[PDB]
């Protein structure tokens, strides 16, 4: 899957947990950036 | 404008640090600096992930 | 090293590089020549220093060995004099050029299992090892050493020899054409001392641009790149134009009397003999190698020409190692380092029970 | 694909007849709204939902189906849907349309 | 396990039958995703709106 898809999927979880615009801020930060680095960050959840 | 490009790349790297803190992946600015400098045109990320995890599993000793 | 110390040995055209695995670089670099009476026998520095009244022999000149006795003597003087080690107690991984002859490998294996009687060894391609050092198991590595050149494609690691591009151009013709142009302009670059001086000047002061027209007009209009050198000996000749034409001979071969394809064009033909599914991937993870990659800025021009050559779909993403000089050596340091890689090298027992030709099966 | 988010990608990609990664801009639409609400605030009772679809069905000149629906409403009750009967069926209603535009 | 496959095919078929009685427009596979999602406590009012709004976006 491309990088943008695997960020939103992660973002949804936080919202179910209760983390909200801390998960939208993530949407805007990614959007502001618009490289494969995020894909590495994705693999490293923790 | 090389100094302006230096502040701009520092800004991109600061954006990636903030994301790395939100995901809570345990990476530091200098370690993020080495990892970004490596994958920029080098190794595929999905392998670097297990390499960092293995390096961190070894330092457990 | 929980096990005993490992070894790596690359017998190159201009020098031999030996060392122990995992080290920063080849632990020792010596010349590839033996000295005999024309002291009776010596290796490396002593022979070249006493090359006034003695004979020198080249064990590896153009990637192809000249003598087997000189080969065993170079290996023994690397193991015994360069590093002061015992070969019977050390495993060593050796290199190979593009598509070497099977009988040469048979002789080398018999030598390594008989003259040294070590525990285990391995012998494989060189540029494949350098790619194994470039962390990208897939890509094209263009290696031109001192006596041979090749653009080696590697797809999934096992190179496609049908697309291996062989080029008979190296640093010998480089220094020779540089000396010829210097003497034609009027300088004294003919003699052996002048040969060493011209080679040193080509290594240090020579230049590499992106194109011939722009740098040529720039040097023709003024003398910016013209830098003055006054050595300890006192000789002082400065030419900006000659340092700019020395590297361009890779793109404009008829400057030095060449009828073969250009470096970028060599890689183009290599991709042309390559497959489709691997085409863009190889155009995406190609690396620079060969000591002749010591030219600053030349890698940028190579990448520009590579972006111009192929279609717009893929890109040029070339790995330009500033460790390219020892690029081959570093390669082995990675491979022999791995623990699972320990199964890859072949031992003395099978080589003794089934002959040395089993190295064709075991060392794929 | 069991995990919730994964499904939507597939749901989105077929509802929106396009490619896997191409639809993300609109795909982003759902992530925010679905996340907004997970734990329903309306209590559980299938009968109300059942009573709704008969009434809706009856004022549209289609009244046999007021019991055909009933016959089906027990058929599922016979098999196992794990007490999501109210949530599914309810969905199927709010996406309704009398065949005639009227 | 064969009985499990017959149980699901039987009930998805019944659910498709109601879907055509209400004239909702969902085909079998979109109904398959929809029940699989709503099966984990999804607020089905939120999902209904999402499906309506994408069906209106795909109109171009």
Swiss-Prot record, chain A:
Signal peptide location: none
Compartments where located: Cytoplasm, Cytoskeleton, Microtubule organizing center, Centrosome
Purpose of the protein: Component of the gamma-tubulin ring complex (gTuRC) which mediates microtubule nucleation. The gTuRC regulates the minus-end nucleation of alpha-beta tubulin heterodimers that grow into microtubule protafilaments, a critical step in centrosome duplication and spindle formation.
Family, as annotated: Belongs to the TUBGCP family.
Assembly information from the UniProt record: Component of the gamma-tubulin ring complex (gTuRC) consisting of TUBGCP2, TUBGCP3, TUBGCP4, TUBGCP5 and TUBGCP6 and gamma-tubulin TUBG1 or TUBG2. TUBGCP2, TUBGCP3, TUBGCP4, TUBGCP5 and TUBGCP6 assemble in a 5:5:2:1:1 stoichiometry; each is associated with a gamma-tubulin, thereby arranging 14 gamma-tubulins in a helical manner. Gamma-tubulin at the first position is blocked by TUBGCP3 at the last position, allowing 13 protafilaments to grow into a microtubule.
Descriptive protein name: Gamma-tubulin complex component 6
Swiss-Prot record, chain C:
Biological process (GO), any one: regulation of G0 to G1 transition
Name of protein: Actin, cytoplasmic 1
A GO term, aspect molecular function: identical protein binding
Subcellular localization(s) per the UniProt record: Cytoplasm, Cytoskeleton; Nucleus
Pfam family, one: Actin
Effect of residue 60 to A: Decreased interaction with SETD3
Transmembrane parts of this sequence: none
Chain positions of cross-link (Microbial infection) Isoglutamyl lysine isopeptide (Lys-Glu) (interchain with E-270): 39
Result when mutating residue 68 to E: Does not affect methylation by SETD3
N-acetylaspartate modifications at: 1
Keyword Hydrolase: yes
SMART domains: ACTIN
Cited function: Actin is a highly conserved protein that polymerizes to produce filaments that form cross-linked networks in the cytoplasm of cells. Actin exists in both monomeric (G-actin) and polymeric (F-actin) forms, both forms playing key functions, such as cell motility and contraction. In addition to their role in the cytoplasmic cytoskeleton, G- and F-actin also localize in the nucleus, and regulate gene transcription and motility and repair of damaged DNA.
EC number(s) given by UniProt: 3.6.4.-
UniProt xrefs under SUPFAM superfamilies: Actin-like ATPase domain
Modified residue annotations for N6-methyllysine: 73
Gene encoding the protein: ACTB
Catalytic activity from the UniProt record: ATP + H2O = ADP + phosphate + H(+)
Chain positions of cross-link (Microbial infection) Isoglutamyl lysine isopeptide (Glu-Lys) (interchain with K-50): 259
Effect of residue 135 to S: In CSMH; somatic variant
Changes after translation: ISGylated.
Gene Ontology CC, one term: Schaffer collateral - CA1 synapse
Miscellaneous note of the record: In vertebrates 3 main groups of actin isoforms, alpha, beta and gamma have been identified. The alpha actins are found in muscle tissues and are a major constituent of the contractile apparatus. The beta and gamma actins coexist in most cell types as components of the cytoskeleton and as mediators of internal cell motility.
Swiss-Prot record, chain D:
Protein origin, superkingdom: Eukaryota
Tissue occurrence: Ubiquitously expressed.
Intracellular or extracellular location(s): Cytoplasm, Cytoskeleton, Microtubule organizing center, Centrosome
Subunit comment: Component of the gamma-tubulin ring complex (gTuRC) consisting of TUBGCP2, TUBGCP3, TUBGCP4, TUBGCP5 and TUBGCP6 and gamma-tubulin TUBG1 or TUBG2. TUBGCP2, TUBGCP3, TUBGCP4, TUBGCP5 and TUBGCP6 assemble in a 5:5:2:1:1 stoichiometry; each is associated with a gamma-tubulin, thereby arranging 14 gamma-tubulins in a helical manner. Gamma-tubulin at the first position is blocked by TUBGCP3 at the last position, allowing 13 protafilaments to grow into a microtubule.
Role played: Component of the gamma-tubulin ring complex (gTuRC) which mediates microtubule nucleation. The gTuRC regulates the minus-end nucleation of alpha-beta tubulin heterodimers that grow into microtubule protafilaments, a critical step in centrosome duplication and spindle formation.
Entry similarity comment: Belongs to the TUBGCP family.
Record's protein name: Gamma-tubulin complex component 3
Residues of the full protein shown: 6 to 107 of 907
Swiss-Prot record, chain E:
Family assignment from sequence similarity: Belongs to the MOZART1 family.
Location(s), subcellular: Cytoplasm, Cytoskeleton, Microtubule organizing center, Centrosome; Cytoplasm, Cytoskeleton, Spindle
Residue pairs linked by disulfide bridges in the UniProt entry: none
Transmembrane segments: none
Record's subunit section: Associates with the gamma-tubulin ring complex (gTuRC) consisting of TUBGCP2, TUBGCP3, TUBGCP4, TUBGCP5 and TUBGCP6 and gamma-tubulin TUBG1 or TUBG2; within the complex, interacts with TUBGCP3 and TUBGCP6 to form a luminal bridge with actin that stabilizes the initial structure during complex assembly. Interacts with TUBG1.
Keywords tagged on the record: Acetylation, Cytoplasm, Cytoskeleton
One cellular component term from this protein's GO annotations in UniProt: interphase microtubule organizing center
Function of the protein: Required for the recruitment and the assembly of the gamma-tubulin ring complex (gTuRC) at the centrosome. The gTuRC regulates the minus-end nucleation of alpha-beta tubulin heterodimers that grow into microtubule protafilaments, a critical step in centrosome duplication and spindle formation.
Annotated protein name in UniProt: Mitotic-spindle organizing protein 1
Superkingdom assignment: Eukaryota
Keyword Repeat: no
GO terms under biological process: gamma-tubulin complex localization; microtubule nucleation by interphase microtubule organizing center; mitotic spindle assembly
């Amino acid at each position: 899957l491309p990088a943008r898809n695997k960020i939103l999927m992660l973002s949804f979880d936080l919202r179910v947990g209760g983390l909200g615009p801390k998960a939208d801020r993530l949407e805007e930060l990614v959007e502001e950036l618009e490289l494969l680095e995020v894909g590495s960050v994705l693999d490293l959840l923790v | 404008a090389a100094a302006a490009n230096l502040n701009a790349v520092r800004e991109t790297m600061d954006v990636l640090l903030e994301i790395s803190r939100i995901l809570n992946t345990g990476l530091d600015m200098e370690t993020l600096s080495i990892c970004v400098r490596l994958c920029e045109q080098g190794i595929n990320p999905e392998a670097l992930s297990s390499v960092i995890k293995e390096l961190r599993k070894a330092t457990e000793a | 090293d929980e096990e005993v110390a490992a070894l790596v040995v690359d017998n190159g055209s201009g020098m031999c590089k030996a060392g122990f695995a995992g080290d920063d670089a080849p632990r020792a670099v010596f010349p590839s020549i033996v000295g005999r009476p024309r002291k009776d026998s010596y290796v490396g520095d002593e022979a070249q220093s006493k090359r006034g009244i003695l004979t020198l022999k080249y064990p590896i000149e153009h990637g192809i060995v000249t003598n087997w006795d000189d080969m065993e003597k170079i290996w023994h003087h690397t193991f015994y004099n360069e590093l002061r080690v015992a070969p019977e107690e050390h495993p060593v991984l050796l290199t190979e050029a593009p598509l070497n002859p099977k009988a040469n490998r048979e002789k080398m294996t018999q030598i390594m299992f008989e003259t040294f009687n070590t525990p285990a060894m391995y012998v494989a391609i060189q540029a494949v090892l350098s790619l194994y050092a470039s962390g990208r198991t897939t890509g094209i590595v263009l290696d031109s050493g001192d006596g041979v050149s090749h653009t080696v494609p590697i797809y999934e690691g096992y190179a496609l020899p049908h697309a291996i591009l062989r080029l008979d151009l190296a640093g010998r013709d480089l220094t020779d054409y540089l000396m010829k142009i210097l003497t034609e302009r009027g300088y004294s670059f003919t003699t052996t001392e002048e040969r060493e001086i011209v080679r040193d000047i080509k290594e240090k002061l020579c230049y590499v641009a992106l194109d011939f027209e722009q740098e040529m007009a720039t040097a023709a209009s003024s003398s910016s790149l013209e830098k003055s050198y006054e050595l300890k000996d006192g000789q002082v000749i400065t030419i900006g134009n000659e340092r700019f034409r020395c590297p361009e001979a890779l793109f404009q071969p008829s400057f030095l009397g060449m009828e073969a394809c250009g470096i970028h064009e060599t890689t183009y033909n290599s991709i042309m003999k390559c497959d489709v599914d691997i085409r863009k991937d190889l155009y995406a993870n190609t690396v620079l190698s060969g000591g002749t990659t010591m030219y600053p800025g030349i890698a940028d021009r190579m990448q520009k020409e590579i972006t111009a050559l192929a279609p717009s779909t893929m890109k040029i993403k070339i790995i330009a190692p500033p460790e390219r000089k020892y690029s081959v050596w570093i390669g082995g340091s990675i491979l022999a380092s791995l623990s699972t890689f320990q199964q890859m090298w072949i031992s003395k027992q099978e080589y003794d029970e089934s002959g040395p030709s089993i190295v064709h099966r075991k060392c794929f | 694909q069991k995990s919730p988010n994964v499904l939507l990608q597939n749901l989105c990609c077929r509802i929106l007849g396009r490619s896997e990664a191409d639809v993300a801009q609109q795909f982003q639409y759902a992530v925010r709204v679905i996340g907004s609400n997970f734990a329903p605030t309306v209590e559980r009772d299938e009968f109300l939902v059942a009573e709704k679809i008969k009434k809706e069905l009856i004022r549209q000149r289609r009244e046999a189906d007021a019991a055909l629906f009933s016959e089906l409403h027990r058929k599922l009750h016979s098999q196992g849907v794990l007490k999501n009967k109210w949530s599914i069926l309810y969905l199927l209603l709010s996406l309704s349309e009398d065949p005639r535009r009227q």
